[PDB]
Amino acid sequence: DKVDYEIDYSTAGYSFWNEVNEEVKETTTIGKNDTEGCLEIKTSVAASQNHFIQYHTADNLPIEIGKEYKLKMMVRGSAEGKLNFGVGPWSGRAEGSFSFNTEWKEYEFSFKAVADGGHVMTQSGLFVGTIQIKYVKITHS
């Protein structure tokens, strides 16, 4: 697999778009954990809807409409849980989900790009605990 795009949170900072609904603002944090070296999303109260805790995990993707790619995400959580994602611009995305657990694993998602560019929209409002994301990559064969 050839790498088109990588963000490696073990070294680089987190500065992408993120939004927590007022419903769970006080009990949710999204940002880089400098000690672990990961993007970290922590919740102590589940949101009523999964998209109520939403954040880009990668942005300005070098993908072209109609071509085949993979999304790769290295993630673990404090318990078993699911995050949903879409790859694409605000206008519409290629969507999927990863079921993670307490072990570090790289999950993969194959897709046809639905547009040029965009971001990896990631959503986990229903999950209570700590999600850690070490890196995100877009690849092709």
- In sequence order, what are the beta bridge partners of 8? 135
The C-alpha torsion from 77 through 124 and 120 to 14, rounded to 10°, is -60
Which CATH number is 42's domain given? 2.60.120.260
Q: Rounded to 5 degrees, what angle do the CA atoms 105, 138, 75 make?
A: 20
Expressed in Å, this structure's resolution amounts to 1.8
The total domain count for the chain is 1
What is the DSSP code string of the chain?
Answer: -EEEEEEETTTS---S-EEE-GGGGGGEEEEEETTTTEEEEEESS--SSGGGEEEESS-S----TT-EEEEEEEEEESSSEEEEEEEE-TT--EEEEEEE-SS-EEEEEEEE-SSSS-EEEEE-TT--EEEEEEEEEEEE-
Count of beta carbons in the 10 Å neighbourhood of residue 51? 14
Measured CA to CA, the distance from residue 72 to residue 75 in angstroms comes to: 10
Domain that holds residue 68: 1-141
Dist. CA 11–CA 118, nearest whole Å:
23
